[PDB]
Design a binder for this molecule. Structure first.
Ligand SMILES: O=c1ccn([C@@H]2O[C@H](COP(=O)(O)OP(=O)(O)O[C@H]3O[C@H](CO)[C@@H](O)[C@H](O)[C@H]3O)[C@@H](O)[C@H]2O)c(=O)[nH]1
Length: 436
């Protein structure tokens, strides 16, 4: 009997539900805790689709008294209500896996339950190394003053520059600066850490974390990746216009563009993207999240006259788009869920990091030889990226055939990490043994 507790946002619900499907295939009774009311509507649609596809999982509604960063506080300010709810649950609990962003309030709840508790870090193992090494960094008070490189011993990336550090982690009086300083030292009071990654993309960082090389006192970190897309996420769209447009395209020519689940780009930066998409000469599938006269007349004309581009304002099926053979490139913000998905389908990535851990995730892909990202573009809002750079970068990636070779073997390593040897297969087997 395992209990799951995802955080707000599709970036945390998607890997948690994919973790549930893999646990259910290992014959388990999984209890999915849902902090309701949920934030986004896509979270509501994925839950009911997953709960209907697996009616055997237990849904424990975590009701909170009266916006992704809004219920952030309401969960930890009311986390003392899950103690009567989780303890009044039979079959008796055997393990607990919650989100890393909830490691601060859920640790006293998990220790007072008597079960081996874990966290599920929804990002890369290299970023988890930066999260673990962060206490050791700030202790040397020459920070952020004289900090040029963050050299964590044995991680996949060489040396994390100051440019790749999340900006709020350097300024005083910052929330994530204080969140990292209290959540990271709590990692020692855990039984382990599950990360959506495999050896084919993060071999060194996984061996550095398990070898006690980042920081001392770390529990065993498990690479239960990749979290391959499942069928409960598939929406039966009555139109299905996107998949049928990709069918009439030569395989490997469409450039999929998506910046995640929020897309906080301004109206200025959105104009140059579409301006660079048509200036690259390649066909594109641009997914935009408004949360409207942004595109230009001659830009919309060239997208229709040349007959190459699709622009959608909807929650698309990214699994089918990346899995479609017509897609040969991926312009991504390097969110780790989209990275592991692109690694599963063997689609090379043009990294465009925006905030947070996306510059580190972009270097993990670039180190593997199946991704390219320009360091000069900086974070979102630092400066305007012209469409000439966008078209030039897209042409540099789609013409680079060696990226497809490395992305193909990463797909092979991903297909081998869940079947024959399977780091995901073994680690999940090694987790069922401690959950006796
Ligand atoms: O139209 C869309 C948009 C998104 N997705 C899916 O939604 C998820 C998005 O995950 P990800 O690519 O990681 O994006 P975010 O949700 O923005 O990721 C957040 O969470 C990640 C994990 O913590 C962090 O690495 C990122 O920086 C942070 O932005 C994936 O399953 C996508 O395939 C779709 O299916 N369709």
């Amino acid at each position: 009997h395992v209990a799951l507790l995802p955080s707000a946002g599709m970036g945390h619900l998607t890997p948690f539900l994919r973790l549930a499907s893999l646990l259910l295939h290992q014959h388990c009774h999984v209890t999915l805790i849902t902090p309701q009311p949920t934030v986004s509507k896509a979270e509501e649609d994925l839950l009911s689709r997953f709960l209907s596809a697996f009616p055997q999982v237990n849904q424990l509604h975590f009701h909170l008294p009266p916006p992704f960063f809004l219920q952030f506080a309401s969960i930890r300010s009311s986390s003392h209500l899950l103690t009567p709810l989780l303890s009044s649950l039979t079959p008796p609990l055997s393990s607990f896996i919650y989100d890393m962003t909830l490691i601060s309030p859920l640790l006293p709840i998990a220790e007072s339950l008597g079960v081996p508790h874990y966290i599920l870090f929804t990002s890369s193992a290299t970023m988890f190394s930066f999260f673990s090494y962060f206490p050791t960094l700030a202790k040397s008070e020459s920070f952020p003053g004289k900090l040029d490189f963050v050299e964590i011993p044995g991680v996949s990336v060489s040396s994390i520059p100051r440019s790749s550090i999340p900006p709020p982690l350097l300024v005083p009086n910052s929330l994530f600066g204080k969140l990292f300083m209290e959540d990271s030292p709590k990692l020692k009071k855990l039984h382990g850490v599950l990360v959506n990654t495999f050896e084919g993309i993060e071999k060194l960082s996984l061996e550095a974390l398990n070898g006690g090389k980042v920081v001392k006192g770390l529990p065993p970190v498990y690479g239960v990746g990749p979290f391959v897309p499942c069928e409960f996420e598939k929406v039966v769209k009555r139109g299905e216009t996107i998949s049928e447009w990709l069918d009439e395209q030569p395989s490997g020519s469409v450039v999929y563009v998506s910046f995640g689940s929020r897309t906080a780009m301004g109206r200025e930066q959105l104009r140059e993207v579409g301006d660079g998409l048509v200036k690259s000469g390649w066909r594109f599938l641009w997914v935009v999240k408004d949360k409207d006269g942004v595109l230009g007349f001659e830009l919309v004309e060239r997208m229709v006259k040349e007959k190459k581009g699709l622009v959608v304002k909807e929650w698309v099926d990214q699994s089918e788009i990346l899995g479609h053979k017509a897609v040969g490139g991926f312009v991504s913000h390097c969110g780790w869920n989209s990275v592991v998905e692109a690694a599963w389908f063997g689609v090379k990535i043009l990294g465009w990091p925006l905030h947070g851990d996306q510059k580190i995730n972009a270097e993990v892909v670039a180190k593997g030889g199946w991704g390219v990202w320009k360091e000069g573009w900086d974070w979102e809002g630092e400066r305007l990226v012209k469409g000439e750079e966008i078209g030039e970068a897209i042409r540099e990636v789609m013409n680079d055939e060696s990226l497809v070779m490395k992305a193909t073997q990463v797909k092979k390593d991903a297909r081998k990490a869940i079947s024959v040897g399977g780091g995901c297969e073994v680690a999940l087997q090694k987790l069922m043994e401690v959950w006796k």
